[PDB]
Write a protein that binds this DNA or RNA. Structure first.
Ligand SMILES: [Mg+2]
Ligand SMILES: [Mg+2]
Ligand SMILES: [Mg+2]
Ligand SMILES: [Mg+2]
Ligand SMILES: [Mg+2]
Lengths: 773, 774
DNA sequence: GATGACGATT
DNA sequence: CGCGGTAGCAGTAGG
DNA sequence: CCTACTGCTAC
DNA sequence: CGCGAATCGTCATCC
């Protein structure tokens, strides 16, 4: 056969056709690895080869067949989309598969062009979890007998290899979970190197030779059982409610008996693979696509922010998107393709009416797209550059707080935090709408002034509502509003029953048969609207032309209707929820919300209203003010002790001439003999992520270095006057922190209110400059 | 008209069709900006709009029509030019007629638009190549249309520089004129430079300004007697005319020509070809043809210099797209990331026949195979690069890099103009690319021959040393530089002075088979097999071809038809330059060389032999060893002086109680009164790129920071005793440097031999490790 | 039935 | 997870 | 002769 | 300088 991305095995379809394997890989780069391994003259005699092995590309993610089939009774009818899929239709041609056959007898199977198919997917969760599950679901849906009789197989490859400086042999892992456990449980990985294999093509020469030296001893066969049929419907059927049930809990790990049994005979039940590999993907896809309720960010957008703060710290000089993306993927350990990261960066910096972000993390330099095309008319990442919206970020995400956040560790190293805790509840302040596994995500930004009133009343005791709001929250009866935002909207909003709705604006003119549309409902792109209207034969009966005179950010569509306005009212219908002229031009939109978010420790959580998201975020922000303030108190005490000792050394440096002492170790003794405290200076000047316990526990690992590396410029008494000034100001700050801790209703309430005013100033300023500053 | 990537102008094809403009842009990103400008209702009615403007993208670089017409019959377009989606799409939108000549005002009034406006990027690729190609399209078919102003241009800046406070930036239209302007400035410490790689890079307040002044920034092209010949020079089928034209630099326009252009906004095509198109072509030669000193193009030099920076603290491996981003930022890369990621991958490939016998990087992952010519490499997201630091440390000494002349991009230091490696790298690799005017092709010279020549030139004790120096003086060959055979299991033969490459085969009459066990030099396996079966004459005697090649090796099974072996010998003649199986299976290959390189001064140079490239490289490497040694002498003198002062303070630190002085000034007064020299410590500790005289004049004009920033631990007698040794080792090294300078046959000859031995050991190690060094 | 959307992924 | 179009020069080949 | 490949560095 | 095939979960509309 002549199929694209297919390299035939020599004996395929011939006398020895049942001795051949079809290696299905994720893409061309993975095919290049398989080609290299099958072309080894020094792997023999059991080394695989093109005598009995073929290659075919799966084209990345294949199509879910279970969701494109209609049952018919006297029959399973395949849809167009499934019938005309090039990748799957190529696999059917290469294998000589027949949808009418059920392949139960070894006669019936011996007319196939290959003996089996071996899924050589990448070990990333997308590969073994998603793509492999889709392939298993394809065969189970059409030819379940082939799974019973061992036709569907798998090649196991590592996902992580960690090498030691000594040992010539690495430690190999097949799951990020099991490596991360191994990494934290290790003492330190100081002389190791960790390598994550996002695709097959990442394996090096001597690594490829090892994998093919043990090829068939890494090939596993799939098996079927009664439990499989229902599980395939759970994970890949049409009812997402089951996914909502399955994804409430984490994966149930394999027992020591199941693991040992599987590896001894190299057989994997389809039910176990769906429960472990496929499910682990499904939970992971939720973490990628569903944002956290604390900061309203996905993992990519949080890595992009954390990387942005690092990259745009020294300079904040603009950098092109493709350059910034590489920095993010390197310093924040990003295990996926650069295409999806570069696009996320652009979507994170877009600022137009209807955009996802009312308060974008970055400033966009260049053509970043327009409302009229929904932001998809942005320039390629090679031209446009981003730049941190540093005034907003510095106020919304305080730098002091970031040391105290819990952090994700990828490849054995610290990466982005598990979550940020912004000063205002950012998860309800922006727009969002994307699907995921099991749950959909959709948010419509809440009004800024309502958020301020509510949050400020919770913290400001002098606010009239302070008694009363806390009493209301304990009994879950809400008194203050959280209404949809009206910013960047030239229309109005209405609330009917259980939904809020969005309304455009229009103007009629009787002198010359025109309707001028000057606003569309929230998040509606102009071009698609015009297209969608002219695609109506009902309406276009009465329109002769539609002309678009909108400006870059505004909307102005002139619609030339003979006297037909009367019919429109008759042909359509007028209610208290929608004018007929507003039915004629679809100027109405329903604010459907799907408030599903991710938990701090991990998992899905469903919210019923925007109020609960605010109430759930407040304790984390309340508690975080304690740690900063508590830690500042602890560090200030130590810095005072250190500076006081240094000023005492400067006062004793002239008589206590260090010039005469022989060694570094001697000089450390004479400072101890003079009553100087041994101090762990590096931790005092730069505590970084040190917890309070670590602070007090390691502050005594002294070395007297804080004196010995003191420069001569510090001996000058003006530098010493600045030190004594610094001591007095730190001693003054210490007493304000003690008061700020003993504050009501909780430590740091006044600090929270100050920073709330600071964030508001940044938003007001950004809003007046179109987030250009 | 329903043309792809075309947004119809409202009055196109109507009464007011001659008032409508077609904006031709470089691509989609540029189209989106024009859309933003055409859709401003506050740009004043002055601003243009979609009432009278259309957009179409040119698809990047358009097709050269002048080389796809026979036209002698008038204007006969070949299939490829007839079926060009971009060009025939512009003909569809405008309603152009190849049979019309557009002399009269009927014929121009039968056009769907009034003119076309080239809104190309201001980089030399845009206005020089693409616009010149577009002008050549209209000039070739409808010269009258250019006479009457149908072809136009929108002028846009290429660089903008902003000063703190000042609101209006200074704008440039040529990188050369900015680079000149930058050097004459005092310092760019309070400026910011910005390069516009495409139109889409302009920001909001910039786009609003450009469209506010749209009508007065559009220029019209005009024709003259000299234009027709110049269009044939630059875009015709005689490369010899390009070879003559590109010998010379661009001749800048006089203030009279500049004033005339800007006063009426009309540009002669001859002038545009002479400045913009030529400036591109000269630049393209520098981009694509490598320098004869280091054998690198401009991009590969940026990739090396960027690699040394990236992999300096940590030779930790990085993905190609990550490293590519690093290079484009730190080395100022003004082009697309696609060709940069590709150049990086080709720079790290190591397989038989690959361009590089001595790759700059180590490749971790699938970096491609001999069988597909390296086009089966993984996507840049999977594979990783890593500096071949042992090779880089020896071939490109770090000390030398401080002394090279450097390129300055955006007013800042980038990659060097050229490296001067320890061995002549331009004759040590394989190369083959076209360019403007000249082609480039080299076949790597044998390493043992390279060593013999270079070692004899430097080692006075070599028997051939006296005799070799006589040979360079008269350009006569005494020693051989034969093509390299490394990673080649075939044969090489010499006829006249041309080398040929031979595969290897084994015949088998027991079962009518020819087994090919090697292909000629640089011949890719897959393309070779196809080339054989696409000839029906050869396939007459072939029933099957089977490919059993291994990772680097070759084993192609060729099965013949029953009684063909006797008939092949007659049908395929047996000469002394190939027998009848090497003609039959095309197992011979000629090492054609095109030794054209780029000069240090910025021009092309043609060489006649590989000897001349070696002879031309030797002076640069000889002088660099001198310059290096002289500067070390200068720095060592200063560091000794500085350390001597520091140790004298440590012995005087007890009496000179800095504790009692109030400010640094007092401290500066009291040390000077004690005879301490004011020193420019930063320059003495870190000379960086300071020239020797530049060094000599400022190192003794600084202050007392070398004293004031001394920490207390240095006052300990152990720390001052370590300094006194450090001074003593520098004083010994100073006397050794004076010996190396007083050396024969030239200063630093013995060091050159040392570093040659270091380079060979590194190459031997890489060759034993498959260029993994692990 | 058939055909669209998003963000973060292959 | 992949995909093309274009220039430039000069060799080869096939037709 | 015409037309089609092939490379690297670009759009 | 540009091009595409796929998933997922609700929502929409045209015939
Ligand atoms: Mg993958
Ligand atoms: Mg992780
Ligand atoms: Mg003293
Ligand atoms: Mg450009
Ligand atoms: Mg330059």
């Amino acid at each position: 056969v002549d199929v694209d991305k297919y390299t035939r095995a020599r004996n395929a379809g011939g006398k020895r056709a049942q001795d051949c394997m079809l290696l299905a890989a994720e893409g061309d780069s993975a095919l290049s690895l398989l080609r290299t391994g099958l072309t080894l003259g020094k792997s023999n005699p059991s080394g695989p080869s093109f005598d009995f092995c073929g290659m075919i590309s799966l084209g990345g993610v294949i199509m879910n067949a279970c969701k494109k089939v209609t049952n018919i009774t006297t029959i399973m009818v395949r849809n167009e989309q499934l019938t005309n899929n090039k990748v799957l239709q190529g696999i059917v041609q290469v294998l000589g598969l027949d949808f009418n056959c059920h392949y139960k007898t070894q006669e019936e199977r011996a007319k196939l062009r290959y003996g089996c198919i071996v899924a050589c997917v990448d070990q990333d969760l997308d590969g073994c979890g998603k793509i492999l599950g889709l392939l298993l679901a394809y065969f189970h849906l059409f030819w379940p007998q082939l799974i019973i009789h061992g036709f569907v197989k798998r090649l196991l490859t590592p996902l992580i290899r960690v090498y030691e400086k000594g040992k010539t042999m690495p430690v190999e892992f097949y799951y990020e979970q099991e490596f991360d456990a191994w990494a934290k449980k290790q003492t330190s990985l100081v002389n190791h190197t960790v390598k994550y294999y996002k695709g097959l093509a990442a394996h090096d020469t001597h690594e490829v030779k090892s994998m093919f030296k043990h090829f068939d001893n890494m090939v596993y066969t799939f098996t079927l059982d009664d439990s499989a049929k229902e599980l395939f419907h759970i994970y890949f059927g049409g009812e997402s409610e089951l996914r909502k049930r399955e994804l409430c809990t984490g994966v149930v790990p394999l027992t020591e008996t199941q693991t040992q049994s599987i590896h001894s005979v190299r057989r994997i039940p389809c039910s176990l693979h769906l429960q472990v590999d496929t499910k682990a993907y499904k939970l992971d896809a939720i973490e990628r696509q569903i944002p956290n309720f604390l900061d309203g960010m996905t993992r990519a957008r949080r890595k992009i922010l954390a990387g942005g703060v690092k990259c745009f710290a020294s300079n904040n000089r603009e950098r092109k998107v493709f350059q910034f993306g590489g920095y993010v993927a390197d310093h924040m350990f990003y295990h996926h393709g650069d295409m999806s990261l570069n696009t996320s960066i652009i979507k994170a910096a877009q600022y137009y009416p209807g955009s996802s972000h009312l308060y974008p993390v970055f400033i966009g330099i260049g053509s970043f797209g327009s409302r009229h095309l929904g932001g998809k008319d942005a320039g390629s990442p090679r031209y446009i550059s981003v730049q941190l919206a540093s005034e907003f970020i510095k106020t919304m995400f305080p730098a002091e707080d970031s040391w105290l956040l819990p952090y994700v560790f990828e490849d054995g190293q610290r990466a982005e935090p598990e979550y940020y805790v912004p000063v205002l509840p950012l998860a309800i302040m922006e727009y969002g709408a994307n699907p995921s596994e099991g749950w959909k995500y959709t948010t419509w930004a809440r009004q800024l002034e309502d958020i301020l009133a509510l949050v400020r009343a919770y913290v400001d005791k002098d606010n009239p509502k302070h008694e009363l709001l806390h009493y209301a929250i304990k009994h879950k009866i809400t008194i203050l509003p959280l209404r949809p935002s009206n910013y960047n909207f030239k229309g109005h909003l209405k609330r009917f029953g259980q939904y809020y709705y969005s309304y455009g604006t229009y103007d009629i003119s009787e002198q010359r048969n025109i309707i001028t549309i000057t606003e569309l409902p929230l998040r509606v792109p102009t071009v698609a609207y015009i297209e969608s209207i002219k695609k109506s034969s009902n309406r276009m009966t009465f329109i002769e032309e539609i002309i678009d005179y909108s400006s870059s950010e505004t909307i102005e569509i002139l619609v030339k209707l003979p006297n037909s306005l009367n019919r429109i009212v008759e042909e359509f219908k007028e209610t208290e929820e929608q004018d007929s002229i507003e039915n004629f031009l679809r100027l109405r939109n329903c604010l459907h919300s799907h408030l599903n978010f991710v938990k701090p420790k991990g998992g899905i959580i469903e919210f019923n209203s925007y109020y609960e998201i605010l109430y759930a975020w407040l304790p984390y922000r309340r508690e975080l003010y304690q740690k900063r303030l508590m830690r500042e108190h602890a560090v200030l005490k130590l810095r005072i002790i250190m500076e006081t000792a240094i000023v005492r050394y400067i006062n004793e440096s002239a008589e206590l001439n260090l010039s005469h002492y022989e060694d570094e170790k001697e000089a450390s003794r004479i400072l101890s003999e003079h009553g100087f405290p041994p101090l762990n200076h590096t931790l005092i000047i730069s505590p970084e992520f040190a917890s309070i316990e670590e602070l007090n526990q390691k502050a005594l690992q002294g070395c007297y270095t804080y004196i010995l590396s003191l420069q001569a410029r510090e001996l000058l008494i003006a530098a010493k006057t600045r030190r004594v000034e610094k001591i007095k100001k730190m001693q003054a700050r210490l007493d304000k922190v003690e008061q700020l801790l003993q504050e009501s209703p909780f430590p740091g309430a006044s600090v929270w209110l100050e920073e709330i005013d600071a964030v508001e100033k940044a938003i007001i300023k950004g809003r007046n400059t179109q987030w250009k500053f």
